[PDB]
Design a protein around this ligand. Structure first.
Ligand SMILES: [Zn+2]
Ligand SMILES: [Zn+2]
Ligand SMILES: [Zn+2]
Lengths: 252, 193, 207, 47
């Protein structure tokens, strides 16, 4: 156990590993490995989208793209007012978690209706990838145009072929697998951070061997079934449970 | 099998490698299915050159795994780029090279090396990402080495064998070894059957 | 052993050529050093350790191989160094260099072309493989063994919520063992049981 | 509800620096929020 913590600290001092790899290699819990990463001075987005409008056959196609994965959602608009752009943004924010929207300085994007939608759904709008996505979507649309009667069917068939049928990148994944893996990794991070804060609201008085007195207040990191890991004096150490007292702390 | 791949290419226009993977057909059949439609690799290596601390760093990347190889140069001529490409071809099987419109990537020595080593040189999101990651590792462990080249080679070791990220949870060296071994077994089975 | 490497240096045309050999496959890497100081030997070892997994190294009792720079490189890269095949590979590389000497002006292009010829153009042995296919197959098989023993516990770290017959509440988090096409094997309270696929929910359950 | 009680107890502790049992009995708020009010003051201590 403590040998695993010592090997993890020496290996991070050499190579600066991440906490998932250290927890899987050295067989330590994840809160301990995250503390080892968080104590290092040299070691201290999944919700950003971009939007654009374009033209095809006299129609208006609005395109939104998830940036870290390349994931496309598109639609055909009857006009280019601010109310239709606000309805598209409200549908997108109701289906995927959107926190940061990046657009250009168009007219319909600089509007009171889009501003009201961003106020209600709590999005950060920023005015200045989508050009490459418009070119790629237009090549697929021309590649499958003879199978559809209307332009709306061809647009949605091209979105399906782009998202699930084209493979590339490092491991040969599509865009849907990449967006799902990215958001799932972020969810794991936030749940572990909630556990970390709830544990770190405590305090530990511990008694070393060959002494009767209690030492200073060390902060609890992990409380197991038979052992206790504490941080004290910028040092992580493992004390048995029969030489410890854990009390609540009020130091806000 | 072949009719199922013809239905899939009729609807969605898959390429020949994806059909040969997902349907387990020999690659000449998938090449003929793709070539019959009028509407339409484990050895692809990209190269680039960048600058840091007034020095010139040259970076090659194996694309199917993300495997890196870097070198420090005192000059940006064509002879040292040809020496880098010749050592890379002498170490790993290089077949399809991808570069940009540079001054050293169009040279007589590079053309002689590509002709002698039988490499198809083609010209133009992955190389920029790998250069960015390598620079972050270099600035992360810069104060452990005196010279710049020691820090470059230590960044290459840390990137290849100490960063187990991504979807599958594999580092770059284990990925490139498993990829070329599986491709070799597939070519042996396609030659035997 | 699948990660044992041997190193040596030799002389040719007044130069110093350093040669490293993977033993279990006969894989050759070589370079031309400007001198025989410990800094160039340590830089060669650092590039070799950054390219291929090196764990166990064998050398002679040389003057640059016994040096503080090489000891610092082995400490940083976690290699086990032992002092006392390479002579035979030097013999083979010298013969190949004399075979294709007239195609290159300098010695260095001849060295790199001889390395490529020996690695990918000399097939022999038992199965009819060259050295590169042997070293790739060796490291791939070793990796498959150790990763098998880790991957089983990785797949058993999932949690399954299932439903039994004629009860409409979802039973607690059993552990996954194998996921099939129409059935799922779970371990629930030290009882291995088989549930249909349409009566299960497999979560990782961050919480 | 005791949400106005939370605001009133914060104003009262900003004046007189009460303890937590006094605020929990006077303002009828639960004990956890009264202990948190005493914990956030830099001059007092929950005891
Ligand atoms: Zn660190
Ligand atoms: Zn086609
Ligand atoms: Zn107070």
């Amino acid at each position: 156990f403590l040998d695993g913590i010592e090997k993890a600290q020496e290996e991070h001092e050499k190579y600066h590993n991440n906490w998932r790899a250290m927890a899987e290699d050295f067989q330590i819990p994840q809160v301990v490995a995250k503390e080892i990463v968080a104590q290092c001075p040299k070691c201290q987005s999944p919700k950003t989208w971009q939007m654009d409008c374009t033209h095809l056959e006299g129609k208006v196609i609005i395109v939104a793209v998830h940036v870290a994965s390349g994931y496309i959602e598109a639609e055909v608009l009857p006009a280019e007012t601010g109310k239709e752009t606000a309805h598209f943004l409200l549908k997108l924010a109701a289906r995927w978690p959107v926190k940061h929207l990046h657009t250009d300085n168009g007219d319909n994007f600089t509007s009171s209706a889009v501003q009201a939608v961003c106020w209600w759904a709590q999005i950060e709008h920023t005015f200045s990838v989508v050009e490459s996505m418009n070119h790629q979507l237009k090549t697929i649309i021309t590649q499958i145009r003879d199978q559809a009667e209307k332009i709306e069917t061809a647009v949605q068939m091209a979105v399906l072929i782009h998202n699930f049928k084209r493979k590339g990148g490092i491991g040969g994944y599509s865009a849907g697998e990449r967006i799902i893996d990215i958001i799932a990794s972020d969810l794991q991070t936030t749940k572990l951070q909630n556990q970390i804060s709830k544990i770190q609201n405590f305090r530990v008085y511990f008694r070393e061997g060959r002494d009767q007195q209690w030492k200073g207040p060390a902060t609890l990191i992990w409380k197991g079934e038979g052992a206790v890991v504490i941080q004290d004096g910028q040092d992580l150490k493992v004390v048995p449970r029969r030489k410890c007292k854990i009390i609540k702390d009020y130091g806000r």
